[PDB]
Every structure is written in structure tokens, then in C-alpha cells.
PDB file of C-alpha atoms (C1' of nucleotides) in Angstrom:
ATOM      1  CA  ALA A   1       5.866  22.366 -17.010  1.00 33.87           C
ATOM      2  CA  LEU A   2       4.415  24.624 -14.544  1.00 32.20           C
ATOM      3  CA  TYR A   3       1.088  24.367 -13.046  1.00 27.99           C
ATOM      4  CA  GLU A   4      -1.492  27.009 -12.525  1.00 29.84           C
ATOM      5  CA  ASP A   5      -4.504  25.895 -10.439  1.00 28.40           C
ATOM      6  CA  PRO A   6      -7.767  26.837 -12.336  1.00 28.72           C
ATOM      7  CA  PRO A   7      -9.734  29.485 -10.614  1.00 26.96           C
ATOM      8  CA  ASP A   8     -12.134  28.487  -7.766  1.00 24.92           C
ATOM      9  CA  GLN A   9     -15.451  27.325  -8.972  1.00 24.59           C
ATOM     10  CA  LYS A  10     -17.402  28.166  -5.968  1.00 21.96           C
ATOM     11  CA  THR A  11     -20.920  27.174  -7.714  1.00 22.86           C
ATOM     12  CA  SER A  12     -21.997  23.365  -8.391  1.00 22.09           C
ATOM     13  CA  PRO A  13     -22.585  21.768 -11.829  1.00 24.75           C
ATOM     14  CA  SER A  14     -26.508  22.588 -11.089  1.00 24.03           C
ATOM     15  CA  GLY A  15     -25.731  26.424 -10.130  1.00 30.64           C
ATOM     16  CA  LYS A  16     -25.673  25.739  -6.248  1.00 30.69           C
ATOM     17  CA  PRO A  17     -23.593  27.749  -4.156  1.00 32.40           C
ATOM     18  CA  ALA A  18     -20.934  26.021  -2.054  1.00 31.41           C
ATOM     19  CA  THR A  19     -22.022  25.683   1.371  1.00 34.45           C
ATOM     20  CA  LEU A  20     -19.094  23.945   2.823  1.00 32.07           C
ATOM     21  CA  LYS A  21     -15.176  24.268   2.047  1.00 32.55           C
ATOM     22  CA  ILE A  22     -12.746  21.517   3.598  1.00 32.01           C
ATOM     23  CA  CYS A  23      -8.793  22.081   3.513  1.00 27.20           C
ATOM     24  CA  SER A  24      -6.348  18.942   3.768  1.00 25.37           C
ATOM     25  CA  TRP A  25      -2.772  19.795   4.352  1.00 22.63           C
ATOM     26  CA  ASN A  26       0.214  17.315   5.164  1.00 21.10           C
ATOM     27  CA  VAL A  27       2.081  19.973   7.386  1.00 23.24           C
ATOM     28  CA  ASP A  28       5.230  17.912   7.826  1.00 23.43           C
ATOM     29  CA  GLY A  29       5.750  19.067  11.453  1.00 20.49           C
ATOM     30  CA  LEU A  30       2.850  21.368  12.914  1.00 18.64           C
ATOM     31  CA  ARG A  31       5.121  23.211  14.982  1.00 16.42           C
ATOM     32  CA  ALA A  32       7.525  24.109  12.139  1.00 16.57           C
ATOM     33  CA  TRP A  33       4.504  24.759   9.691  1.00 17.48           C
ATOM     34  CA  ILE A  34       3.033  27.364  12.184  1.00 18.37           C
ATOM     35  CA  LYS A  35       6.682  29.372  12.810  1.00 19.13           C
ATOM     36  CA  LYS A  36       6.564  29.177   8.640  1.00 17.25           C
ATOM     37  CA  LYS A  37       3.354  30.930   8.595  1.00 16.60           C
ATOM     38  CA  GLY A  38       1.049  28.351   7.684  1.00 16.66           C
ATOM     39  CA  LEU A  39      -1.989  29.440   9.840  1.00 18.94           C
ATOM     40  CA  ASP A  40      -2.069  32.748   8.170  1.00 18.87           C
ATOM     41  CA  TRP A  41      -2.768  30.994   4.757  1.00 22.13           C
ATOM     42  CA  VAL A  42      -5.507  29.088   6.815  1.00 24.04           C
ATOM     43  CA  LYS A  43      -7.021  32.338   7.877  1.00 24.70           C
ATOM     44  CA  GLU A  44      -6.939  33.898   4.370  1.00 24.80           C
ATOM     45  CA  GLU A  45      -8.638  30.467   3.176  1.00 28.16           C
ATOM     46  CA  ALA A  46     -11.122  30.687   5.730  1.00 27.63           C
ATOM     47  CA  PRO A  47     -12.147  26.840   5.463  1.00 27.28           C
ATOM     48  CA  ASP A  48     -15.141  25.329   7.591  1.00 29.93           C
ATOM     49  CA  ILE A  49     -13.083  22.079   8.098  1.00 27.99           C
ATOM     50  CA  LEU A  50      -9.129  22.003   8.345  1.00 25.87           C
ATOM     51  CA  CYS A  51      -7.653  18.323   8.147  1.00 25.13           C
ATOM     52  CA  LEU A  52      -4.012  18.001   8.893  1.00 24.10           C
ATOM     53  CA  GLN A  53      -1.673  15.199   8.485  1.00 20.66           C
ATOM     54  CA  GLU A  54       2.078  14.560   9.844  1.00 22.95           C
ATOM     55  CA  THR A  55       1.310  16.745  12.921  1.00 19.07           C
ATOM     56  CA  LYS A  56       4.762  15.610  14.566  1.00 20.62           C
ATOM     57  CA  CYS A  57       3.234  17.014  17.715  1.00 22.46           C
ATOM     58  CA  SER A  58       1.394  15.736  20.750  1.00 21.16           C
ATOM     59  CA  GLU A  59      -1.566  17.486  22.022  1.00 20.18           C
ATOM     60  CA  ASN A  60      -0.075  19.148  24.875  1.00 19.97           C
ATOM     61  CA  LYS A  61       2.719  20.523  22.712  1.00 19.37           C
ATOM     62  CA  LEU A  62       0.158  22.354  20.419  1.00 19.49           C
ATOM     63  CA  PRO A  63       1.377  26.236  20.040  1.00 22.30           C
ATOM     64  CA  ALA A  64      -1.442  28.553  21.597  1.00 20.28           C
ATOM     65  CA  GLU A  65      -2.085  30.268  18.186  1.00 22.29           C
ATOM     66  CA  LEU A  66      -3.867  27.006  17.257  1.00 22.33           C
ATOM     67  CA  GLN A  67      -6.286  27.515  20.046  1.00 20.72           C
ATOM     68  CA  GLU A  68      -6.732  30.926  18.832  1.00 19.91           C
ATOM     69  CA  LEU A  69      -8.637  30.220  15.500  1.00 16.38           C
ATOM     70  CA  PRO A  70     -12.170  31.247  16.395  1.00 16.02           C
ATOM     71  CA  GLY A  71     -13.888  29.881  12.688  1.00 16.69           C
ATOM     72  CA  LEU A  72     -12.018  26.582  13.640  1.00 17.32           C
ATOM     73  CA  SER A  73     -12.624  26.125  17.242  1.00 15.33           C
ATOM     74  CA  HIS A  74     -13.741  22.338  17.267  1.00 19.84           C
ATOM     75  CA  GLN A  75     -10.135  20.485  17.224  1.00 18.16           C
ATOM     76  CA  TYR A  76      -9.425  16.990  17.449  1.00 16.20           C
ATOM     77  CA  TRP A  77      -5.790  15.363  17.655  1.00 15.35           C
ATOM     78  CA  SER A  78      -4.183  11.905  17.332  1.00 15.80           C
ATOM     79  CA  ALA A  79      -0.765  10.970  17.827  1.00 17.84           C
ATOM     80  CA  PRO A  80       1.207   7.762  18.130  1.00 17.46           C
ATOM     81  CA  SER A  81       1.265   6.249  21.512  1.00 15.87           C
ATOM     82  CA  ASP A  82       4.850   5.070  21.260  1.00 17.65           C
ATOM     83  CA  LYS A  83       6.779   7.141  18.399  1.00 19.06           C
ATOM     84  CA  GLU A  84       6.591  10.716  19.523  1.00 16.85           C
ATOM     85  CA  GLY A  85       7.740  13.125  16.499  1.00 18.47           C
ATOM     86  CA  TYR A  86       6.220  10.878  14.109  1.00 20.48           C
ATOM     87  CA  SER A  87       2.867  10.900  12.194  1.00 20.17           C
ATOM     88  CA  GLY A  88       0.005  12.677  13.941  1.00 22.97           C
ATOM     89  CA  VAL A  89      -3.262  14.031  12.362  1.00 23.35           C
ATOM     90  CA  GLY A  90      -5.863  16.792  13.413  1.00 22.56           C
ATOM     91  CA  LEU A  91      -9.309  17.802  12.319  1.00 22.20           C
ATOM     92  CA  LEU A  92     -10.148  21.497  13.159  1.00 23.71           C
ATOM     93  CA  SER A  93     -14.252  22.323  12.397  1.00 29.10           C
ATOM     94  CA  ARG A  94     -16.359  25.523  12.589  1.00 31.10           C
ATOM     95  CA  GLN A  95     -19.125  23.506  14.011  1.00 30.73           C
ATOM     96  CA  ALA A  96     -18.974  20.610  16.332  1.00 31.14           C
ATOM     97  CA  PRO A  97     -19.117  17.028  14.636  1.00 32.58           C
ATOM     98  CA  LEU A  98     -22.089  14.905  16.035  1.00 30.58           C
ATOM     99  CA  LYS A  99     -19.372  12.192  16.563  1.00 27.79           C
ATOM    100  CA  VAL A 100     -15.493  12.120  16.548  1.00 26.29           C
ATOM    101  CA  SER A 101     -13.745   8.453  16.472  1.00 26.40           C
ATOM    102  CA  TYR A 102      -9.846   7.551  15.986  1.00 26.99           C
ATOM    103  CA  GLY A 103      -8.739   4.644  13.910  1.00 26.52           C
ATOM    104  CA  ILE A 104      -9.792   2.171  11.430  1.00 29.48           C
ATOM    105  CA  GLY A 105     -10.602  -0.193  14.288  1.00 30.08           C
ATOM    106  CA  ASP A 106      -8.013  -2.333  14.282  1.00 28.42           C
ATOM    107  CA  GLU A 107      -5.190  -2.715  16.556  1.00 30.41           C
ATOM    108  CA  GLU A 108      -2.397  -3.503  14.380  1.00 30.75           C
ATOM    109  CA  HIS A 109      -3.067  -0.209  12.344  1.00 31.41           C
ATOM    110  CA  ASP A 110      -4.584   2.235  14.844  1.00 32.92           C
ATOM    111  CA  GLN A 111      -1.296   2.784  16.999  1.00 32.77           C
ATOM    112  CA  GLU A 112       0.120   5.574  14.820  1.00 34.13           C
ATOM    113  CA  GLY A 113      -2.432   8.357  15.092  1.00 32.43           C
ATOM    114  CA  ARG A 114      -3.364   8.482  11.006  1.00 32.77           C
ATOM    115  CA  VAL A 115      -6.986   8.455  11.100  1.00 32.56           C
ATOM    116  CA  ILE A 116      -9.491  10.805  12.567  1.00 34.02           C
ATOM    117  CA  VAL A 117     -13.538  10.089  11.658  1.00 34.06           C
ATOM    118  CA  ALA A 118     -15.957  12.901  12.005  1.00 33.65           C
ATOM    119  CA  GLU A 119     -19.466  12.641  11.492  1.00 34.90           C
ATOM    120  CA  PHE A 120     -21.529  15.570  10.312  1.00 35.81           C
ATOM    121  CA  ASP A 121     -25.363  15.757   9.761  1.00 38.63           C
ATOM    122  CA  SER A 122     -25.104  15.060   6.020  1.00 38.11           C
ATOM    123  CA  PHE A 123     -21.953  13.293   5.509  1.00 40.57           C
ATOM    124  CA  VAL A 124     -19.249  11.311   7.277  1.00 40.39           C
ATOM    125  CA  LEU A 125     -15.648  12.883   7.009  1.00 41.12           C
ATOM    126  CA  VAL A 126     -12.338  10.803   7.310  1.00 39.42           C
ATOM    127  CA  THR A 127      -8.786  12.417   7.385  1.00 44.00           C
ATOM    128  CA  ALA A 128      -5.677   9.962   6.736  1.00 43.44           C
ATOM    129  CA  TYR A 129      -2.161  10.107   6.712  1.00 43.75           C
ATOM    130  CA  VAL A 130      -1.769   6.395   5.047  1.00 42.00           C
ATOM    131  CA  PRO A 131       1.380   4.329   5.901  1.00 43.03           C
ATOM    132  CA  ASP A 132       4.486   5.059   3.681  1.00 42.26           C
ATOM    133  CA  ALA A 133       6.108   1.907   1.936  1.00 40.42           C
ATOM    134  CA  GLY A 134       9.195   3.527   2.630  1.00 39.65           C
ATOM    135  CA  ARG A 135      12.922   3.793   1.476  1.00 40.29           C
ATOM    136  CA  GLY A 136      13.509   0.461  -0.251  1.00 42.78           C
ATOM    137  CA  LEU A 137       9.795  -0.729  -0.007  1.00 43.77           C
ATOM    138  CA  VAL A 138      10.768  -1.914   3.842  1.00 43.96           C
ATOM    139  CA  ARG A 139       7.154  -1.235   4.978  1.00 44.47           C
ATOM    140  CA  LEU A 140       5.403  -2.141   1.670  1.00 43.28           C
ATOM    141  CA  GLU A 141       3.882  -5.612   3.075  1.00 41.19           C
ATOM    142  CA  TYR A 142       2.516  -3.312   5.850  1.00 41.02           C
ATOM    143  CA  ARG A 143       1.091  -0.680   3.497  1.00 42.68           C
ATOM    144  CA  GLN A 144      -1.066  -3.550   1.559  1.00 42.49           C
ATOM    145  CA  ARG A 145      -2.415  -4.926   4.916  1.00 42.47           C
ATOM    146  CA  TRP A 146      -3.154  -1.210   6.133  1.00 44.14           C
ATOM    147  CA  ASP A 147      -4.975  -0.738   2.554  1.00 42.69           C
ATOM    148  CA  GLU A 148      -7.000  -4.126   2.994  1.00 43.31           C
ATOM    149  CA  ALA A 149      -8.226  -2.886   6.683  1.00 44.19           C
ATOM    150  CA  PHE A 150      -8.738   0.897   5.498  1.00 42.47           C
ATOM    151  CA  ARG A 151     -11.040  -0.613   2.550  1.00 42.74           C
ATOM    152  CA  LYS A 152     -12.850  -2.781   4.768  1.00 38.14           C
ATOM    153  CA  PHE A 153     -13.320  -0.177   8.021  1.00 41.77           C
ATOM    154  CA  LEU A 154     -14.264   2.791   5.245  1.00 40.30           C
ATOM    155  CA  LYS A 155     -16.806   0.197   3.209  1.00 41.86           C
ATOM    156  CA  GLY A 156     -18.845  -0.630   6.382  1.00 42.82           C
ATOM    157  CA  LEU A 157     -18.653   2.998   8.074  1.00 46.83           C
ATOM    158  CA  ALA A 158     -21.846   1.704  10.661  1.00 47.58           C
ATOM    159  CA  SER A 159     -24.287   4.331   9.001  1.00 47.36           C
ATOM    160  CA  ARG A 160     -25.549   5.378   5.567  1.00 43.02           C
ATOM    161  CA  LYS A 161     -24.566   9.047   4.808  1.00 43.63           C
ATOM    162  CA  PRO A 162     -21.924   9.678   2.207  1.00 43.85           C
ATOM    163  CA  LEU A 163     -18.340   9.351   2.598  1.00 42.97           C
ATOM    164  CA  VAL A 164     -15.600  12.207   2.163  1.00 42.79           C
ATOM    165  CA  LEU A 165     -12.249  10.510   2.775  1.00 39.78           C
ATOM    166  CA  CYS A 166      -9.568  13.401   2.695  1.00 41.81           C
ATOM    167  CA  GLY A 167      -5.995  13.216   3.488  1.00 40.72           C
ATOM    168  CA  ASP A 168      -2.219  11.940   2.209  1.00 41.29           C
ATOM    169  CA  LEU A 169      -2.979   8.319   0.731  1.00 42.87           C
ATOM    170  CA  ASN A 170       0.483   8.117   0.092  1.00 44.89           C
ATOM    171  CA  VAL A 171       0.254   7.035  -3.550  1.00 43.16           C
ATOM    172  CA  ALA A 172       0.029   8.371  -7.054  1.00 45.46           C
ATOM    173  CA  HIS A 173      -2.961   6.571  -8.347  1.00 48.13           C
ATOM    174  CA  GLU A 174      -1.765   6.914 -12.101  1.00 48.84           C
ATOM    175  CA  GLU A 175       1.177   8.137 -14.254  1.00 49.73           C
ATOM    176  CA  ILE A 176      -0.691  11.323 -14.853  1.00 50.99           C
ATOM    177  CA  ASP A 177      -0.188  11.693 -11.045  1.00 48.87           C
ATOM    178  CA  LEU A 178       3.410  12.307 -10.752  1.00 51.90           C
ATOM    179  CA  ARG A 179       6.073  13.949 -13.007  1.00 55.42           C
ATOM    180  CA  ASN A 180       8.600  10.574 -13.548  1.00 53.69           C
ATOM    181  CA  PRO A 181       6.547   7.503 -13.357  1.00 52.81           C
ATOM    182  CA  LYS A 182       9.002   5.554 -15.414  1.00 53.18           C
ATOM    183  CA  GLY A 183      11.519   5.887 -12.676  1.00 56.33           C
ATOM    184  CA  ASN A 184       9.321   5.656  -9.611  1.00 56.77           C
ATOM    185  CA  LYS A 185       7.610   2.214 -10.731  1.00 55.82           C
ATOM    186  CA  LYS A 186       9.740   0.745  -7.937  1.00 54.97           C
ATOM    187  CA  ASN A 187       9.603   3.843  -5.432  1.00 58.13           C
ATOM    188  CA  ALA A 188       7.260   4.299  -2.694  1.00 56.46           C
ATOM    189  CA  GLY A 189       3.608   5.829  -3.625  1.00 57.42           C
ATOM    190  CA  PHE A 190       4.112   4.423  -7.013  1.00 55.30           C
ATOM    191  CA  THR A 191       4.616   0.437  -6.651  1.00 54.78           C
ATOM    192  CA  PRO A 192       1.813  -1.437  -8.638  1.00 52.45           C
ATOM    193  CA  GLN A 193       0.853  -2.921  -5.201  1.00 50.29           C
ATOM    194  CA  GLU A 194      -0.023   0.498  -3.827  1.00 51.47           C
ATOM    195  CA  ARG A 195      -1.879   1.775  -6.989  1.00 51.58           C
ATOM    196  CA  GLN A 196      -4.063  -1.326  -7.075  1.00 53.72           C
ATOM    197  CA  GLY A 197      -4.889  -0.756  -3.463  1.00 53.80           C
ATOM    198  CA  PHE A 198      -6.054   2.754  -4.486  1.00 56.08           C
ATOM    199  CA  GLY A 199      -7.976   1.320  -7.310  1.00 58.98           C
ATOM    200  CA  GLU A 200      -9.693  -1.282  -5.127  1.00 59.31           C
ATOM    201  CA  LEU A 201     -10.559   1.736  -2.533  1.00 58.94           C
ATOM    202  CA  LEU A 202     -12.365   3.263  -5.376  1.00 55.02           C
ATOM    203  CA  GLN A 203     -14.350   0.274  -6.610  1.00 52.14           C
ATOM    204  CA  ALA A 204     -15.125  -1.330  -3.288  1.00 51.08           C
ATOM    205  CA  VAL A 205     -16.159   1.474  -0.871  1.00 54.48           C
ATOM    206  CA  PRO A 206     -16.986   2.817  -3.598  1.00 56.45           C
ATOM    207  CA  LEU A 207     -15.373   6.382  -3.948  1.00 57.07           C
ATOM    208  CA  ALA A 208     -14.522   8.829  -6.647  1.00 55.08           C
ATOM    209  CA  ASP A 209     -11.559  11.187  -7.094  1.00 52.54           C
ATOM    210  CA  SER A 210     -12.797  14.753  -6.920  1.00 49.18           C
ATOM    211  CA  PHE A 211      -9.952  16.588  -8.719  1.00 50.60           C
ATOM    212  CA  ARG A 212      -9.964  13.723 -11.319  1.00 46.99           C
ATOM    213  CA  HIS A 213     -13.529  13.528 -11.830  1.00 47.26           C
ATOM    214  CA  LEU A 214     -13.426  17.439 -12.580  1.00 45.78           C
ATOM    215  CA  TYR A 215     -10.102  17.203 -14.420  1.00 45.12           C
ATOM    216  CA  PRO A 216      -9.603  13.882 -16.305  1.00 46.55           C
ATOM    217  CA  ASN A 217      -6.666  14.810 -18.281  1.00 46.75           C
ATOM    218  CA  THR A 218      -5.109  17.906 -16.478  1.00 47.07           C
ATOM    219  CA  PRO A 219      -1.208  16.953 -15.865  1.00 46.19           C
ATOM    220  CA  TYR A 220       1.464  18.589 -13.757  1.00 43.02           C
ATOM    221  CA  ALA A 221      -1.286  18.715 -10.925  1.00 37.76           C
ATOM    222  CA  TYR A 222       0.893  17.616  -7.869  1.00 39.54           C
ATOM    223  CA  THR A 223       0.517  18.200  -4.077  1.00 41.95           C
ATOM    224  CA  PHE A 224       3.812  16.679  -2.670  1.00 44.84           C
ATOM    225  CA  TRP A 225       7.308  17.789  -4.241  1.00 45.55           C
ATOM    226  CA  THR A 226      10.612  16.403  -2.524  1.00 43.09           C
ATOM    227  CA  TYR A 227      12.654  19.197  -0.813  1.00 45.58           C
ATOM    228  CA  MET A 228      15.685  17.674  -2.263  1.00 48.74           C
ATOM    229  CA  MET A 229      17.160  19.181  -5.500  1.00 50.40           C
ATOM    230  CA  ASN A 230      14.422  21.928  -5.184  1.00 52.14           C
ATOM    231  CA  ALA A 231      11.974  19.757  -7.041  1.00 56.87           C
ATOM    232  CA  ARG A 232       9.200  22.277  -6.272  1.00 58.35           C
ATOM    233  CA  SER A 233      10.896  24.679  -8.444  1.00 57.33           C
ATOM    234  CA  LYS A 234      10.628  22.733 -11.501  1.00 57.33           C
ATOM    235  CA  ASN A 235       7.340  21.058 -10.620  1.00 56.14           C
ATOM    236  CA  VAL A 236       8.741  17.553 -10.273  1.00 64.06           C
ATOM    237  CA  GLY A 237       6.214  16.093  -8.153  1.00 63.85           C
ATOM    238  CA  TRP A 238       3.315  13.550  -7.137  1.00 62.71           C
ATOM    239  CA  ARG A 239      -0.210  13.893  -6.161  1.00 62.79           C
ATOM    240  CA  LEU A 240      -0.464  12.094  -2.754  1.00 60.45           C
ATOM    241  CA  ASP A 241      -3.092  14.440  -1.423  1.00 61.62           C
ATOM    242  CA  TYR A 242      -6.753  13.626  -2.276  1.00 59.56           C
ATOM    243  CA  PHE A 243     -10.623  14.165  -1.552  1.00 62.21           C
ATOM    244  CA  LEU A 244     -12.369  11.094  -2.452  1.00 61.13           C
ATOM    245  CA  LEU A 245     -16.204  11.027  -1.990  1.00 63.71           C
ATOM    246  CA  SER A 246     -19.051   8.852  -2.536  1.00 60.99           C
ATOM    247  CA  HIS A 247     -20.889   9.037  -5.925  1.00 60.70           C
ATOM    248  CA  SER A 248     -23.841  10.728  -4.045  1.00 60.40           C
ATOM    249  CA  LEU A 249     -21.706  13.722  -3.194  1.00 64.15           C
ATOM    250  CA  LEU A 250     -20.781  14.322  -7.011  1.00 66.38           C
ATOM    251  CA  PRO A 251     -23.848  16.254  -7.795  1.00 68.55           C
ATOM    252  CA  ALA A 252     -22.617  18.377  -4.834  1.00 69.36           C
ATOM    253  CA  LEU A 253     -18.908  18.850  -5.894  1.00 66.89           C
ATOM    254  CA  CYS A 254     -18.513  22.258  -6.857  1.00 64.65           C
ATOM    255  CA  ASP A 255     -14.756  22.237  -7.166  1.00 62.86           C
ATOM    256  CA  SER A 256     -11.397  20.497  -5.790  1.00 63.65           C
ATOM    257  CA  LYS A 257      -8.231  22.619  -5.420  1.00 60.02           C
ATOM    258  CA  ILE A 258      -4.344  22.371  -5.332  1.00 60.15           C
ATOM    259  CA  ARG A 259      -2.782  25.369  -3.478  1.00 61.96           C
ATOM    260  CA  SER A 260       0.418  24.861  -5.457  1.00 59.37           C
ATOM    261  CA  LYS A 261       1.459  28.346  -3.944  1.00 58.88           C
ATOM    262  CA  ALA A 262       1.134  27.654  -0.104  1.00 59.15           C
ATOM    263  CA  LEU A 263       4.377  27.146   1.422  1.00 59.30           C
ATOM    264  CA  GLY A 264       5.327  25.510   4.955  1.00 55.90           C
ATOM    265  CA  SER A 265       5.697  21.956   3.967  1.00 55.75           C
ATOM    266  CA  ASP A 266       6.957  19.430   1.226  1.00 55.88           C
ATOM    267  CA  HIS A 267       3.200  19.165   0.536  1.00 55.42           C
ATOM    268  CA  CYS A 268       0.725  21.654  -0.871  1.00 54.13           C
ATOM    269  CA  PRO A 269      -2.679  22.316   0.985  1.00 51.94           C
ATOM    270  CA  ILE A 270      -5.678  20.970  -1.041  1.00 48.62           C
ATOM    271  CA  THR A 271      -9.405  22.209  -0.935  1.00 48.00           C
ATOM    272  CA  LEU A 272     -12.743  20.929  -1.896  1.00 49.71           C
ATOM    273  CA  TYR A 273     -16.046  23.140  -2.016  1.00 48.86           C
ATOM    274  CA  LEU A 274     -19.392  21.387  -1.696  1.00 50.21           C
ATOM    275  CA  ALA A 275     -22.974  22.558  -1.901  1.00 52.52           C
ATOM    276  CA  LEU A 276     -25.080  20.788   0.845  1.00 50.74           C
TER     277      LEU A 276
ATOM    278  C1'  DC B   1      13.456  10.211  -5.144  1.00 50.57           C
ATOM    279  C1'  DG B   2      15.738  13.464  -8.561  1.00 49.56           C
ATOM    280  C1'  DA B   3      19.955  13.282 -10.728  1.00 48.16           C
ATOM    281  C1'  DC B   4      23.011  10.919 -13.021  1.00 48.04           C
ATOM    282  C1'  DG B   5      25.886   7.189 -15.146  1.00 44.29           C
ATOM    283  C1'  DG B   6      26.338   3.234 -17.513  1.00 44.11           C
ATOM    284  C1'  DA B   7      24.215  -0.379 -20.603  1.00 41.67           C
ATOM    285  C1'  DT B   8      21.414  -1.572 -24.269  1.00 42.83           C
ATOM    286  C1'  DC B   9      18.577  -0.413 -28.327  1.00 42.43           C
ATOM    287  C1'  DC B  10      17.267  -0.077 -33.693  1.00 46.22           C
TER     288       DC B  10
ATOM    289  C1'  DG C   1      17.288  26.036  29.393  1.00 46.93           C
ATOM    290  C1'  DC C   2      19.675  25.733  25.300  1.00 47.19           C
ATOM    291  C1'  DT C   3      22.696  23.913  21.417  1.00 46.74           C
ATOM    292  C1'  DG C   4      24.666  20.401  18.408  1.00 48.16           C
ATOM    293  C1'  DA C   5      25.622  15.627  17.433  1.00 45.31           C
ATOM    294  C1'  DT C   6      23.342  11.663  16.311  1.00 38.45           C
ATOM    295  C1'  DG C   7      19.415   8.732  14.539  1.00 42.19           C
ATOM    296  C1'  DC C   8      15.078   7.947  12.001  1.00 40.59           C
ATOM    297  C1'  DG C   9      11.405   8.580   8.987  1.00 37.75           C
ATOM    298  C1'  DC C  10       9.738  10.565   5.342  1.00 34.44           C
TER     299       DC C  10
ATOM    300  C1'  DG D   1      25.164   7.295 -31.812  1.00 33.15           C
ATOM    301  C1'  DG D   2      20.434   9.562 -30.217  1.00 32.18           C
ATOM    302  C1'  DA D   3      16.979   7.724 -27.460  1.00 31.82           C
ATOM    303  C1'  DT D   4      15.470   5.056 -23.893  1.00 30.25           C
ATOM    304  C1'  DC D   5      16.174   1.722 -19.719  1.00 27.09           C
ATOM    305  C1'  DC D   6      17.413   1.155 -15.295  1.00 26.89           C
ATOM    306  C1'  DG D   7      20.330   0.730 -11.007  1.00 24.85           C
ATOM    307  C1'  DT D   8      23.058   3.437  -7.657  1.00 23.78           C
ATOM    308  C1'  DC D   9      24.146   7.508  -4.589  1.00 24.99           C
ATOM    309  C1'  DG D  10      23.590  11.405  -1.989  1.00 26.57           C
ATOM    310  C1'  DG D  11      20.870  14.261   0.031  1.00 28.35           C
ATOM    311  C1'  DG D  12      16.231  18.557   2.157  1.00 31.78           C
ATOM    312  C1'  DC D  13      13.939  18.353   6.251  1.00 31.03           C
ATOM    313  C1'  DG D  14      11.397  17.779  11.032  1.00 30.05           C
ATOM    314  C1'  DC D  15      11.439  15.983  15.323  1.00 28.89           C
ATOM    315  C1'  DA D  16      13.785  12.908  19.600  1.00 31.95           C
ATOM    316  C1'  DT D  17      17.431  11.735  22.589  1.00 35.55           C
ATOM    317  C1'  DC D  18      21.241  12.987  25.070  1.00 36.02           C
ATOM    318  C1'  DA D  19      25.399  14.912  26.576  1.00 36.77           C
ATOM    319  C1'  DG D  20      27.589  19.057  28.054  1.00 38.39           C
ATOM    320  C1'  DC D  21      27.167  23.075  30.635  1.00 35.76           C
TER     321       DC D  21
END
DNA sequence: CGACGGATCC
DNA sequence: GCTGATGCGC
DNA sequence: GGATCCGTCGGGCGCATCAGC
């Protein structure tokens, strides 16, 4: 069945106005995403913080339009040291973070430009392109170790301000998070190993799924669709993109959106509204 | 990884 | 510089 | 035999390299 994201709730449960909008988007090729008119959707969306994943683009090769967004002038980029054309993350902010760091503090996992940490006054933001388990599950065991190191890095993130984890976590937590869970329990992103790791992220850090807290039984809500067999036209997809938040932030949670109409990638943009 | 084809199931 | 084959990873 | 279970195949994209010119 198709999916129409409910209208934006730009007010919290206590009637407080959204002071912060964050947009996360796996662009599957930032230079391609821009030629495909992706920055135009960002302009219309006017986010305060824009997190991008799978940039596939080093810093010296970023298109000049990216350095022309005035409401997103604070830009921070991370790419693999060896694999050019692979992975890559980005954080564009209206206001300068107090602190910007890269990696989960672990050499085995900090080589593929997958994590940017940005400390703001009231919260700590973390964008992530989590390792894929791969065709045939070749990189599953690596994903399992990444999960362990990520869980630990996040739980002890130095200080005590709430956490907003955003990005491509590369798993569909439960069966409601993908069209075909039965034929994908042995396919990357639906292995029980990965699904349990997400569960442990939630219990250990701890964190909550913004979208699922608001929409616990909303089906067909996906963020990724294979380009193959035009899976997007039939909404056969997976929710791999999320905003996970400390429970301290749930009183500030106005909404968590899925922008199913925005094109440019095999992923759709997600958006969080927060009243801080 | 969605689609498909074969195998099995009551 | 520019394109197309080839390879690799989603 | 309609419905379900499950393994195999073939394929959309982006970007890198390299050759040729």
C-alpha cells in the first residue's frame, strides 16, 4: 500500500512551538543528488541542521552550490581515508556547533567517514552511515563489531546532555519497518543479528525511535527503496533512516517526518521537529 | 533484494 | 578534457 | 490445488580507474 506521511505537527504535546528542525538524507552520491535537484528541496525544507550520508565525495570536490546555502553555512565533511567514491557523511548547520568531532573513537571503525558528532548548547547530535552487512552477509560480522563499538561510544559520549542520533542505521528494526520481512530475514538490514543490535542500542544508550514513539502501528512508512524493479512506485521499501533520541527529549518531540516525495536518491529525506 | 520458480503443506 | 569499458559497493 | 515457504537469479544506480585519443 502507498504511504502519505501525516501533516507536519510543528508543535509539541504541551503546545510548545518547534524551535529546531533537523533533516537527515542518504543522498547516494552528493554530486549526482545535486544535479538531480536535491539542494532545491533542502531550500524549500529550510532545516536548521542538515545531515547527509553516502556523500561519495571528498571535500575538495564538493560542488560550489553547497557553499552558497546561507541558512546552512557551518559545514563539516568526513570521507574514507583510502576508499574514494565510497561512504562519506556531512553536517551543515545554521549555527556553529560548540564542538565538532569525527569517528566513534575506534581505529578499526573510524576509517570510512561514517560518523560526525556535533555538540550544541542543549543537545549532542550524531549523524551516522552505519556499515552495511553486504550482499551474501559478507560484512555481517564486521557490522556486529561496529554495533558494539557504536553502542559503547554513544552511551559514554563524555558529557550529560541529551543525544539525537540521526542517519542511516542500515537495519529495519521490526517487521512493520519493511514491506517483505519474510523474504529478507537473511538479507542485509533484516538479519536477527542486526535487529538485536538496534534493540540493544535503544536499551543501552539509552534511546527511543522518534517516528515509532509517535506512530507505533503506522505501516508502509519506509525511507529506502531499491532502484531495481522500480520498488518506489509500489512502495516496497525499508525504514533504514531514523532519528533516535534520549527519553529526556520526548517532551520536546513535536514530530518525525518521512519525506516520501523528495527525489534524488534511493533514500527519502527524514525530518525531526523539536521544541527546545 | 524484488521477483520468480520450485517444493511443500494441509 | 572527455567518454566508455570495467569493477565494486550498495 | 491454493496458499505458503524458501533458494536462486539478475539487475538499478553512483563513482573510480584506465585506456585511448
